[PDB]
Design a protein around this ligand. Structure first.
Ligand SMILES: COC(=O)c1coc([C@H](CO)NC2CCOCC2)n1
Length: 339
């Protein structure tokens, strides 16, 4: 379709210009007031902050450089910031500022108060097929965009999808995203969502994102993921078998789409065939989806998360509040020069 082709050509042109000349050092820490910790990880945290001059709220991801190095995440953190400052799509969280100091890397992103899809899914139990399909369509369009830029996302899971004030998805956490023109090899991603070729230590490509979409759609429509087991080793055994049991309440069209996304043979997997994303967009399960209306955010969403305003944190969890300490001495300057 000429309009999609022209859209994606322009998208790549615009991405490449920012990719080749990344923005750097566009804010500093004392421009913000810290409000609340929204999430943690082994090498950083994400805090709700408020800009002191504008009053705008943001989600500030703070990465400890020394822990990034120790956990062998240097390239991944450089990927994350370089990609985020270069992309632009309705369903991707926007990076507004980035900077670094003696101790930390900072990515200041839009704050989405509706919370993670994970929370809403666990609260409701499962989404109806129309509700799952609305979110899935946004992921399909997002992956069509990312993959056209030679980007692999590699962290699709319900925790990484925020629900915004219109009830639409915003994909967050580009910590594993990478520009890859052929194959890549790193073991990363959450066990339940890993494609077989990742588990088997193969060179893999964008087809792993389409596998993860199959896992996501299954989990949204069932309320639990298809390869569920108590420990990762047992999850991995189920994944590589690819034996999947579908709830009888799944429609036949849903089952057919899922068998083609959860195809162990990556050379047969939807999204990775000659017709690319169009095998997904044209599948019967998506027959009711108006792809353009989704892109233009003209479809009424299945629900609007309850929240009081742009500063409300009620849809996020409570964490111990720790210092944001900045050393008097620069750490790991060399490793993060390009950030
Ligand atoms: C270092 O730890 C993180 O950066 C982190 C941990 O948990 C999360 C979640 C889901 O991954 N995403 C944010 C995105 C912005 O709004 C709150 C949640 N991020």
């Amino acid at each position: 379709q000429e309009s999609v082709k022209e859209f994606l050509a322009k998208a790549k042109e615009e991405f490449l210009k920012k990719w080749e000349s990344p923005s750097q050092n566009t804010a500093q820490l004392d421009h913000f007031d810290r409000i609340k910790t929204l999430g943690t990880g082994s090498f950083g945290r994400v805090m709700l902050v408020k800009h002191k001059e504008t009053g705008n709220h943001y989600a500030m991801k703070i990465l400890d450089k020394q822990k990034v190095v120790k956990l062998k995440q240097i390239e991944h953190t450089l990927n994350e910031k370089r990609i985020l400052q270069a992309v632009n799509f309705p369903f991707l969280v926007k990076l507004e500022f980035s900077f670094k100091d003696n101790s930390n890397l900072y990515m200041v992103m839009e704050y989405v108060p509706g919370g993670e899809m994970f929370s809403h899914l666990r609260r409701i139990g499962r989404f109806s097929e129309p509700h799952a399909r609305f979110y899935a369509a946004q992921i399909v369009l997002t992956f069509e965009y990312l993959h056209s830029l030679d980007l692999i996302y590699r962290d699709l899971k319900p925790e990484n999808l925020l629900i915004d004030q219109q009830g639409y998805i915003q994909v967050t956490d580009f910590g594993f995203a990478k520009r890859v023109k052929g194959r890549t090899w790193t073991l990363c991603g959450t066990p339940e969502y890993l494609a077989p070729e990742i588990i088997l230590s193969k060179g893999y490509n964008k087809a792993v994102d389409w596998w993860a979409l199959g896992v996501l759609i299954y989990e949204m429509a069932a309320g639990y993921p298809p390869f569920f087991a108590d420990q990762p080793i047992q999850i991995y055994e189920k994944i590589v078998s690819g034996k999947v049991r579908f709830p009888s309440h799944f429609s036949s069209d849903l089952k057919d789409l899922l068998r083609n996304l959860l195809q162990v043979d990556l050379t047969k997997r939807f999204g990775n065939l000659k017709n690319g994303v169009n095998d997904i967009k044209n599948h019967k399960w998506f027959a009711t989806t108006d792809w353009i209306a989704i892109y233009q955010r003209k479809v009424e969403a299945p629900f609007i998360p309850k929240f009081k305003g742009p500063g409300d944190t009620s849809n996020f969890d409570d964490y111990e509040e720790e210092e944001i300490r900045v050393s008097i001495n620069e750490k790991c300057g060399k490793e993060f020069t390009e950030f």
